[PDB]
Amino acid sequence: GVTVSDVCKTTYEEIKKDKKHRYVIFYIRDEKQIDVEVIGDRNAEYDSFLEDIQKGGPGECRYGLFDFEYMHQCQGTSESSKKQKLFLMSWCPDTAKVKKKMLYSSSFDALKKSLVGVQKYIQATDLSEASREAVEEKLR
Template sequence: MASGVQVADEVVEEYKFIKKGKKYRYIVFHIKDEKKICIDSSGDRDACYQDYLDHLASLGPDECRYGLYDFEFEHACEGAADTKRSKLILMIWCPDTAKIKKKMLYSSSFDALKHSLEGIGKYIQATDMSEAAPECILEKIKSTARS
């Protein structure tokens, strides 16, 4: 079911910068006026995952967002030293405490965003901080990592 929410051009443009240029560590998107997915904020390359989580927490308990994060982690291939890998994750952040209408809008519009941003490594759904915790994300990434 299409929600009719459009993805703003800026979203796709800036996505190229995080994917190729490594301009940002993360970009947070929101749905503006129930019509368009727009950029809400972004974090520089030196931002860490905690900065991203702090931003989500600062929005309050009833705000939903999408977060694109360039997640770096150590990955050991068999018989090789640990190598730093990075994977782009796209998170839908819908706290349990958010209004049902808002959660439905974000859920139904997630596909539009997924289709606009090609080459995402992992999709994550989080309803609270424990689901968004770095070790939880890492586990999800590694469960599908190709060695």
């Protein structure tokens, strides 16, 4: 079905390997290809990511990649330390047209095969599933 532009992979790798950015928002351009829409600078925080993934309005869907920071403590140790983990999310609000929602759903696997290494996936249809609390519970 839908292809993936090489720019999705290079932007992704600049985060994983070089820590150059904090997040990316992707979109399907003209029902043909997944492209980059927004690149968050490394110092960005999560609220901005959430405001960017919804910036297309209630008729739109998006994908998002975020290098999420949280606190973790390994068994038997005496301290808790900050960690970070990449996750890839699909965002399809209920107000979007079924056709658009289905296309973003069917094309999600094409994007995941392109971003080798991501270990955590989330499919949200409302903000309750994309909150810091929902994500932190997922990344554990």
